Design a protein around this ligand. Structure first.
Ligand SMILES: O=C(CCCN1CC=C(n2c(=O)[nH]c3ccccc32)CC1)c1ccc(F)cc1
Ligand SMILES: O=C(CCCN1CC=C(n2c(=O)[nH]c3ccccc32)CC1)c1ccc(F)cc1
Ligand SMILES: O=C(CCCN1CC=C(n2c(=O)[nH]c3ccccc32)CC1)c1ccc(F)cc1
Ligand SMILES: O=C(CCCN1CC=C(n2c(=O)[nH]c3ccccc32)CC1)c1ccc(F)cc1
Lengths: 391, 391, 391, 391
């Protein structure tokens, strides 16, 4: 019907659509807390009267390679009523928000995808990889070389908020994929930590000066401990926390949603005991401003200075010069040496996907295999890309 | 009791131990064919009279980064009788074969591990990663950018041996992890292709000028096609074969044991449809001669010349200079800048594991983070490491 | 229609009824081998022309407490056509065979029951207990006290028939529940040992001078080894064989159908690792001649001489005197002190069930609790009752 | 760090360790009620400041054969923080409590084991056997001989506390394994009887003058009734209650955790319908004072007077004379005829395990098989050993 910024009167209608669209809907109280991260004009609704479509973005701070922090539009709360499918409501809402996001001066937008087949056509590429490890801790023995053969304390999460906040803040600034976690999201996290009748069990924390793990026993599998979050600033902290987790003698299995480069398997005499049980796209990126994004991040120092011409499909053509870990990215009408869709650049941006891999799928086109190797090396992240928290 | 090279009289006793030790035992006829790959003095047995221990190596040819082919001792048929456990028979047999392998002039030994917790202590490190992808082909749609939007033929494997041989030979020479597949292993492969009463179903082949896929419907899950092997020399061949496999309209799912950098997910509009259902160590490497191995392989051209001192624990100390994609590796008593166990070098050698990841687990020790980045970049493989065939 | 001893012409019709009645039917060749154990007049058929009912008994030798061996009628191959149910054919056939068995001079009849609710009314009581133990052998560690901390050999069963025969013969004579295993059943056992296409895997043997285990990997669960049979004459042999079985390092689990008093759990540091996964009635006994049966077996020496009057319902009344491990059992019309149905006496006879337990269910009636304790102690078996082989 | 009796200030720290260690943790309110059973100096904590280890014992009254009631130290609430494993904290805490328990004058200590591989080395032997029976009540028909072919009432548990208390008190005094159930544990039991939102369903009671059953429908399997507790003083009460339970016509299955000698199967025309679905060690015993324990219990009258010399490993050597159902147990330096570890004596003490079975595992050593038979008969319990309630 019409596409508008919602009034205060629209939010009950938005909560109804949310409840009907999201099985994990956090409820009106929690949703109202997350609103404090939505700027003025950060939300659109379609009315037919009742809300049949909604989408918004939150003001986020995303760490990219080089420990550079970018202002980031975090898309969220995106729903079309089941009564109004195949009516181009998602396309209309995504076009309006992208317009507002671009005009506001955000260099990147980000989201978590409900399905993998939807956001590629709006220029979002999967930029981090979720990697679930399940450890059969009954067989787990630490390698002779593993650090810390206690510095770790078993604590109530709500009693050590200050220490978790300070450790997380250090973590998010040093890791590509890191997000600033504002105070309202700490309020929400520590509320979810407590037990619920017929719901999740009590959360516990393992606290080190340079890391923490939040974990809870699974609702139904009482021999599975699920680590909701492990933030370690040092290798010593990461090993110490895993020694403590393998010490949960009443559990058969410890599971964590981590990143592909988690060193956990190498801490054990049997690397195979850390089984990959699940893999999925994590954070998705849409590069809003190609030159601003490419100039902002740091590049591998190991690759020698090189120049090329990059065309993003309907996204501009640029003279790209990378040397001394920095990029210069300027307008040109010179012949393109590399072509890709905007989504592909998003997938390269945090170093989670190799240019060579995307080239092999013809998502990235060049006639120079030397240029491909140089892109691969340059866009690689020294610190492996991790996922911060879902939004 | 005693450790000897087996006589012809010992092989029936070895087949009994094999049958009792290996649920996948290929049987005496097939085992006798695989013997033709075992050199004179390539086998040891422990007798108590009956065979209570055995181990052997086969003469293999392994492709490493730089399209360099190394003579490789492939350990196989390693068994201790259940009556003679915890008697140091494995250690005795592994020490004797390694002695023979080293003296024979092999720069590397390789194996497939029955368990992950066993071969690390004998200096084997996991060097390739098996990555099972399962595609729900009912939802699978190819991306607009994907090549070849037919060059592929559905054929009987036994009728196109010459073409499979020629395609495989091109594949194995261009890919790190590639093994020469001798004639006896082609005889064995095409025998396993045929249907067995109460066994596997008939194997089919999809044949392209520059690639093939061997597949069969699963024994019990009649909606699952299992790709036993897909060898593609070009991206066009890889895409064409996957278009054909997604055309198996009577199947719900196509599964393949592939490598982490398989571009398949990027060929689809929904990358998530190519689900990682399983991950395990593939080929394990023991570097027998550190300087011969390190000098033999090619290194990334992107990293500028650098020099360091590498100590392998009880494996020598070496002045290591890497530049122009080549390494020089000479004896030194100069202070070590990098320390690691022999197994760790095996894990780095084909580029499947990052020095940075192993350093984070303290399996690789240095005080210079710049040196770590340079090792990471140098040991990286341009062509992603794949697994050839199990032995 | 009519009840007759079958002619040679009837056996094809009997094999058809067998095939249709028994999913485990051994087939006409094996059935013809088992016939050699059926005496002249050991079989009845009901014809309607076609066979609609059959039953037979084999000449067996059953060991009872005191190492006494009784001639035993082993009922088997009992079937009523699905076309002729609820026509009293089973009752007619059981009455005729029991008549022949009694007149032939057998003191006891025995069977394995297809269902638990059928044979009680014909005077059969469950006399042995099948107890399946499943060991998670990955955690299994032997106790410091366990014997034999090798005497055991891994062998092909067919190559050591003489040794298995000799060990079994010693076992069956010393254990209540022991059956003589004739030559035709050894022929049949060693034929079932070999692998079958789309059937069972190859059987292996662990051979000690004073015991053997026959085992095979499960058809479908390739991490489960099933022990079909373990016959140990000494505790040393039993422990040595279990050390070897726990040495099957490619298995997660070892299962055995054993007896409730199997000492296996006490050999381990964690008794709980030997899990009871299944329990069922094994051998069923019908006491044909009460005085002959009661006088034949040995009794506990620990109980002092006592006298009572036992009435079996429609089975006679007897003055029963037990002292010095022997019983005298003579006719009397004196008042009964103990009453029970014939089936209950069968359940007491091998010591598998306590008189006190059966009394608590009112299956055994007396007004003297002292008499109950004395029966309990007297009928107890020093050597625990085991099950020999199914028939 | 240090091992102390806890102050009131320590109990919040103990509740945190409890919550993190025990998935079935009863919560601080219930735990505070169970404290009333812990004597002054009945608890130890290890502090590192925070609680990293705890253990306590409760004052219990345990019935042993001969209807003799022993003061019993019931170990419970035993936990080591996952941060402080493999630091000998359990050994230190168990040594201190055993010292206090011995000095206080308890002849026996008892516990329920979280795992089977832990308490044997501290002298605890499994002394009762939990036996789960599952009845498919749709097929269940009572035998002609079964008593009571109504005396039973369906009631709300909270309304008949006095009658349950009085029946239980009669039960616990007449059965080996019986525990006095104090008022606080009746308060706790009847609170657990009520329904919980997203928790257990409402409990019902079947009440007979001489027995009760407490049962509830399973949370998730709505065709399974679980009997939490059935206490029957007479066989008539036991049968009447089972007739009522088989009358739960909306259920497919009735399950109960009972003892191996439960007469239930013998009440049915098909004994096989009472399936053993689970078997585990119940109560564990550590004999603190060998002579006090052995002299306290009654022995079988059926065995004639005999004398032997018993050595408990690091537990004393004793002249043991058993006659007229009583034992005299005095110091001696005479040659040992029987040797066993302390844990083994615990396993024999309530008659749940036969000396012959433990001898077959070499956990009990003698050279006289006649002595073995006499021990077997003497330590046997006339009334079968049952399990009271878990602690
Ligand atoms: O509603 C959102 C975004 C929140 C997305 N959620 C995504 C992730 C979360 N969760 C988890 O990660 N595990 C959970 C289990 C139960 C419930 C929620 C879980 C929580 C948030 C919202 C609402 C109103 C706004 F203005 C702006 C935004
Ligand atoms: O026995 C071997 C090594 C073969 C290892 N196998 C390892 C891998 C194989 N397989 C598969 O990959 N899938 C299979 C399914 C059923 C049976 C075998 C399968 C086949 C070979 C041997 C025997 C005698 C020698 F002298 C030297 C060596
Ligand atoms: O047919 C019988 C009695 C045999 C009863 N069976 C009962 C037990 C056996 N089996 C097992 O124990 N496991 C088996 C697996 C597959 C097939 C058979 C199995 C084998 C025998 C027979 C036939 C003709 C006669 F004259 C007299 C008697
Ligand atoms: O915490 C204990 C011992 C209690 C052991 N539990 C063991 C057995 C029980 N349970 C069951 O049997 N089924 C249950 C289901 C849900 C919750 C508890 C269940 C309850 C008690 C304690 C606490 C403080 C003390 F001072 C002294 C002692």
């Amino acid at each position: 019907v019409t596409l508008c910024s919602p009034t205060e009167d629209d939010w009950p209608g938005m909560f109804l659509l949310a409840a009907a669209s999201f099985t994990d809907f956090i409820g009106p109280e929690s949703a109202t807390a997350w609103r404090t991260l939505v700027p003025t004009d950060g939300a659109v609704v379609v009315r037919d009267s009742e809300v049949v479509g909604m989408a918004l973005y939150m003001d986020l701070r995303l760490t990219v390679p080089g420990e550079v922090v970018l202002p980031t539009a975090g898309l969220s709360f995106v729903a079309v009523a089941p009564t109004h499918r195949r009516r181009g409501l998602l396309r209309a809402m995504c076009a309006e928000l992208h317009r507002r996001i671009a005009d506001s001066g955000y260099p990147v937008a980000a989201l978590h995808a409900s399905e993998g087949g939807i956001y590629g056509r709006f220029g979002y590429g999967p930029a981090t990889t979720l990697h679930e490890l399940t450890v059969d801790r009954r067989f787990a023995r630490f390698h002779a070389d593993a650090p810390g053969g206690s510095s770790v304390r078993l604590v109530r999460p709500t009693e050590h908020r200050g220490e978790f906040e300070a450790i997380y803040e250090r973590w998010r600034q040093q890791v590509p994929g890191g997000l600033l976690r504002p105070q309202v999201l700490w309020d929400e996290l520590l509320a979810e930590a407590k037990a619920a009748p017929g719901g999740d069990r009590e959360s516990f924390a393992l606290l080190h000066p340079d890391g923490y793990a939040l974990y809870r026993v699974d609702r139904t599998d009482l021999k599975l401990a699920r680590v909701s979050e492990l933030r370690a600033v040092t290798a010593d902290a990461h090993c110490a926390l895993w020694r403590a987790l393998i010490g949960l003698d009443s559990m058969e299995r410890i599971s964590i949603i981590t990143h592909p480069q988690d060193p956990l398997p190498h801490l054990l005499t049997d690397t195979r005991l850390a089984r990959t049980t699940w893999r999925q796209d994590g954070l998705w990126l849409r590069i809003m401003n190609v030159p601003a994004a490419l100039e902002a991040r740091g590049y591998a120092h190991e690759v020698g200075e090189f120049s090329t011409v990059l065309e993003v499909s309907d996204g501009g053509r640029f003279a790209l010069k990378i040397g001394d870990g920095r990029a210069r990215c300027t307008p040109t009408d010179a012949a393109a040496e590399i072509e890709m869709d905007r989504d592909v650049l998003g997938s390269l941006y945090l170093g989670a996907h190799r240019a060579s891999t995307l080239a092999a799928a013809n998502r990235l086109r060049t006639k120079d295999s030397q240029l491909l190797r140089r892109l691969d090396a340059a866009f690689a992240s020294d610190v492996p890309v991790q996922t911060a928290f879902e939004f």
